[PDB]
Design a binder for these strands. Structure first.
Ligand SMILES: Nc1nc2c(ncn2[C@H]2C[C@H](O)[C@@H](COP(=O)(O)OP(=O)(O)OP(=O)(O)O)O2)c(=O)[nH]1
Ligand SMILES: [Mg+2]
Ligand SMILES: [Mg+2]
Ligand SMILES: [Mg+2]
Ligand SMILES: [Zn+2]
Length: 994
DNA sequence: GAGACGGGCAACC
DNA sequence: ATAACGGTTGCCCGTCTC
């Protein structure tokens, strides 16, 4: 039985063992099945191939899964397609993982009091969930979590404590400075837990130096509910009398091996230092505990950490020397390590005292169960009058029954579950943005709420389709279900006052937002312009008070691309030539480790005034930047999703684009029609653009249109040809999410199994259909919510579906969908698409200026200026690279597509112009666009803005004058000069005056 | 060596 | 061409310049 590190060349025959971390099965022309696995015994890894000789072995092959251990016998061959040695297996047997066993007797087990998770930035490697499982299996009565300076593993630890029935001790390894050394904090109770949250907050904010730290006095202030430990070799006492020590409730000592970095003479000195501490805890009646300082599960997991640390260069200084063995140690093996102090002391400090400390810890719940909802005087009642007054002024007094009932039902739910405040705050945020000159785009599931329509938090009106007279208030509603959206109606006059009817209503059920029980916590989503987002953000400090809102924080972890990067460099720097399969496994062992912190892209977390942020999470600065305008949550929004309401104040280009489209045409985009035949025609043809498909390398007219302009969506449009608002809404829905169209709805339509309109194209339809079919609404809602998060179906859901005659293809279709819009989102985004489309057709140059000004960031200006044929040449170059195209080539391709179409429509791009070019805005001149300075590679907004500033306060008098005052590098100056831009100026002036 | 700038990446809606 | 979810903010780090 050969270890995988010993497999180095072709070889007739070997037997080998290992963990299967990947397995795929495929079918050969011959009939035969091939099994392709990767295995690692943790000394190395290898790719294994097996070719079935019969259908029995073929199906067994299908049963080999990740997580299995396997003994394989076979030959070692160079495989030239994989460019690596590989095992061709004749024989395969599943085996036991037979991992480290804990042999002490039940009741007499160890507790680990000092342990690091992947949240110990770039320092630890095994998820807290796996450590917690291991402790449970080894029968440890508890296990502690004590990451460095942070408590970010708490939420996962909790979950795993619950799933596994393990008692977790919530802690912190902290940096204490005297008023810089490590201590261990263990929370005994909720007072202790809250003090932990305060300590991490203070250490990250008031007391952050170059690293989070806690003055000893501030620790004492916040010591209640915490047992304090001395600990490490970076401990206070280990680095040396009794005074220091009497400060601690427990005294830490690590296995002798752990201190092997040696500051010391030999192993006999360390053994004795440990023995001083043993004398010293006994003399002072302080429990001495054998803790492990865990940084990974098993001895061999060491390698992953070694790789992470190595990625930090001489900036780390732990690369100065070999890393200590700090794996999770069994209780019997912890005794072995401490055998020298004899059988009684071994046993005392490894199990009795370790166990005793655990007994001093209660049952702490680090994350709460319920939602805490804000109160602001007048809010419930103001939302009521706002919505009734506004509905009356549109639908009349008294209200039609339909409207009356939607209001009464909606308002008692919003109010009762405590959402009236955020509706109102959302109203003021939108109103201020408008007053400040920035329109706001609608988003997400609040469009499902007519009260939200009435409070001007969404432009989506969810009532059934209908006409309403803007003058006399008369209405007609259609509940036939025959009409998809009011926007689909034919123009019609009020048969009472004569006037032109308004059309509206997308038939969206309120429950998509709050559900039936009101036991779901949605947010409110708003698309503000990216320019304005920060100001919307700051307005929430004014509304709620500076200390009752916090920007949601994020944790930056190592994902695949970074892991593979780290592993290769480590391989390279060490002159290792590794097999693909071994690079993969080292890669996989690095993922999940925290590397940074950051900012949610827009969520503001609201704290009720009768609670405090520390009831929920610590706070800090994103990336630890002490000049940040905003503090962040220490936990990410996902951990506290159900505890506090969130305002998703997002940034987006759509609102900015149509704002500039309006500031340029004078056209009020609210007046744009949603059934203009030429505008709607671009969703299925190039006709309305006045160019050929061959001219613009595209069969539909949606180039540049948000969402619909993509290569995938264009193709869907080619084959679905929508003409109607609700048809566009249907395809918005099926174009967003994996396994929604491809392999699913597409096959269903091409099969004849259902029609385009019957395919599942928003989450709402699932619910609405299941109710129709006879399921209990709240269950239909549950099922909708499960599938739109790509969680598929439970046996109970399927059985409820079947028993009400839901067909097998619909159920199977639910199981595919990985993600899915709510209708109100699709309708919001489509409405914006159509507004912009209107300009694409009727005011083309305005459309292009706004496109290149607001959205584009990657240009080939020389190509663009030469024009049509040159642009096409570049696009073909990028097309040729296929999916081997870099993210950046794709961004360029996207913009060149719209430039080529611009050119074919008869327009063009002029060179940079010293006196007519602007800073960041593409400006209109006749039938052209004069590109702005920031379009130049290397020339950013700043220089762009300076160049414009300087010329406004005095023309340029030489190329030198332009360089000095325009703040231009030599390279940028050459860029202009070589394209003829500076030809009218002398190189320098022979005169200068003040 | 301080600081724009852009690429590459991760988190999130 | 293939297959294909689209679009946004934010953080780190190597490069190029002065
Ligand atoms: N294309 C795409 N859009 C998304 C995705 N996730 C969210 N969005 C868009 C569509 C959603 O309606 C909105 C997401 O906002 P939320 O995360 O607040 O969810 P939503 O409002 O749909 O449900 P909620 O009631 O808030 O739980 O933004 C996604 O994975 N892909
Ligand atoms: Mg330490
Ligand atoms: Mg430690
Ligand atoms: Mg939402
Ligand atoms: Zn009328």
């Amino acid at each position: 039985v050969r270890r995988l590190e010993t497999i180095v060349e072709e070889e007739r025959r070997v037997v080998v063992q290992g963990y299967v971390f990947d397995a795929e099965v495929s079918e050969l022309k011959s009939g035969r099945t091939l099994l392709t696995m990767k295995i690692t015994d943790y000394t190395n890894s290898i790719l294994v191939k097996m070719f079935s000789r019969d259908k029995e072995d073929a199906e067994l092959m299908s049963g080999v899964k990740k997580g299995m251990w396997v003994k394989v016998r076979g030959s070692v061959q160079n495989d030239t397609f994989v460019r690596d040695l590989v095992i061709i297996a004749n024989d395969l047997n599943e085996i036991a993982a037979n991992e480290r066993q804990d042999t002490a007797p039940e009741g007499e087990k160890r507790v680990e009091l000092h342990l690091h998770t992947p949240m110990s930035q770039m320092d630890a490697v095994t998820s807290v969930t796996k450590l917690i499982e291991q402790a449970k299996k080894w029968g440890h009565p508890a296990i502690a979590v004590t990451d460095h300076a942070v408590v970010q593993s708490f939420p996962e630890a909790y979950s795993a404590a619950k799933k596994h029935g393990m008692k977790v001790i919530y802690g912190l390894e902290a940096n204490i400075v005297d008023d810089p050394f490590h201590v261990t904090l263990l929370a005994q109770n909720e007072t202790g837990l809250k003090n932990l949250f305060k300590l991490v907050s203070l250490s990250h904010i008031q007391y952050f130096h170059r690293v989070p730290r806690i003055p000893r006095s501030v620790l004492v202030k916040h010591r209640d509910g915490l047992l304090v430990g001395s600990g490490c070799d970076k401990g206070e006492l280990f680095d040396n009398v009794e005074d220091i020590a009497r400060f601690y409730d427990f005294l830490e000592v690590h296995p002798p091996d752990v201190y092997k970095p040696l500051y010391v003479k030999d192993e006999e000195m360390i053994k004795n230092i440990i023995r001083s501490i043993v004398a010293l805890g006994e003399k002072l009646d302080i429990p001495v505990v054998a803790t492990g300082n865990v940084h990974y599960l098993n001895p061999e997991d060491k390698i992953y950490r070694k790789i992470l640390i190595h990625s930090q260069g001489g900036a780390n200084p732990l690369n100065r020397h070999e890393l200590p063995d700090v794996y999770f140690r069994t209780t019997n093996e912890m005794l072995d390590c401490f055998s020298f102090l004899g059988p009684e002391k071994a046993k005392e400090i490894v199990v009795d005292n370790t166990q005793k400390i655990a007994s001093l810890i209660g049952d702490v719940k680090p994350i709460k169960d319920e939602l805490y909802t804000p109160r602001i005087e007048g809010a419930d009642e103001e939302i009521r009058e706002m919505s009734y007054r506004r509905a009356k002024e549109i639908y009349g007094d008294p209200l039609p029954k339909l409207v009356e009932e939607r209001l009464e039902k909606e308002l008692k739910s919003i109010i009762g579950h405590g959402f009236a405040v955020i509706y109102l705050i959302s109203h003021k945020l939108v109103k201020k943005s408008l007053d400040d000159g920035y329109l706001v785009g609608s988003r997400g599931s609040v469009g499902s709420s007519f009260v939200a329509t009435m409070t001007e938090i969404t432009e989506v009106n969810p009532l059934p389709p209908h006409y309403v007279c803007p003058n006399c208030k008369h209405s007609e509603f259609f509940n036939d279900g025959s009409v998809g959206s009011g926007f689909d109606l034919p123009d019609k006059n009020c048969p009472r006052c004569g006037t032109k009817y308004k059309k509206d209503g997308h038939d969206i059920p309120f429950e998509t937002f709050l559900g039936f029980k009101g036991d779901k916590v949605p947010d409110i989503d708003l698309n503000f312009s990216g320019e304005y987002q920060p100001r919307a953000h700051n307005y929430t400090k004014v509304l709620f008070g500076e200390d009752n809102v916090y920007r949601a924080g994020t944790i930056g972890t190592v994902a695949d691309k970074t892991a593979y990067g780290f592993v290769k460099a480590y391989a390279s720097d060490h002159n290792l030539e590794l097999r693909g399969a071994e690079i993969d496994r080292l890669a996989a062992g690095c993922t999940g480790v925290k590397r940074t912190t950051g900012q949610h892209p827009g969520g503001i977390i609201v704290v009720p005034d009768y609670m405090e942020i520390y009831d929920f999470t610590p706070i800090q600065y994103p990336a630890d930047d002490t000049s940040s305008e905003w503090r962040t949550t220490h936990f990410d929004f996902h951990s506290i999703h159900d505890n506090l309401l969130k305002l998703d104040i997002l940034g987006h280009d759509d609102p900015t684009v149509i704002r500039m489209l309006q500031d340029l045409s004078g056209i009020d985009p609210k007046t744009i029609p949603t059934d203009d035949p030429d505008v709607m025609g671009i969703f299925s043809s190039t006709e309305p653009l006045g160019v050929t498909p061959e001219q613009i390398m595209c069969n539909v007219g949606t180039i540049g249109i948000p969402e619909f302009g993509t290569r995938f969506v264009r193709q869907m449009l080619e084959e679905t040809r929508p003409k109607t608002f609700s048809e566009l809404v249907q395809i918005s829905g099926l174009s967003h999410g994996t396994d929604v169209w491809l392999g699913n709805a597409q096959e269903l339509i091409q099969n004849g199994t259902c029609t385009l309109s019957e395919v599942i194209g928003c989450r709402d339809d699932i619910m609405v259909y299941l109710i129709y079919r006879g399921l209990e609404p709240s269950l239909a809602f549950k099922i909708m919510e499960s599938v739109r998060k790509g969680k598929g179906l439970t046996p109970e859901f399927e059985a409820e579906m079947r028993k009400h005659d839901v067909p097998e293809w619909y159920i199977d279709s639910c199981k595919k969908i990985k993600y899915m819009f709510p209708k109100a989102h699709a309708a919001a985004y489509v409405l914006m698409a159509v507004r912009i489309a209107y300009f694409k057709v009727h005011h083309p140059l305005l459309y292009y200026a706004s496109y290149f000004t607001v959205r584009a960031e990657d240009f080939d200006l020389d190509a663009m200026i030469k024009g049509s044929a040159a642009i096409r040449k570049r696009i073909e170059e990028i097309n040729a690279k296929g999916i081997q195209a870099t993210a950046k080539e794709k961004s360029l391709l996207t913009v060149l597509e719209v430039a080529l179409e611009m050119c074919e429509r008869g327009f063009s791009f002029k060179n940079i112009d010293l006196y007519r070019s602007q800073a960041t805005e593409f400006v209109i001149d006749g039938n052209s666009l004069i590109p702005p300075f920031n379009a130049i590679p290397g020339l950013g907004t700043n220089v762009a803005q300076a160049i414009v500033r300087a010329r406004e306060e005095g023309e340029f008098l030489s190329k030198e004058d332009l360089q000095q005052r325009g703040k231009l590098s030599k390279t940028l100056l050459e860029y202009l000069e070589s394209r003829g831009c500076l030809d009218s100026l002398p190189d320098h002036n022979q005169l200068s005056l003040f």
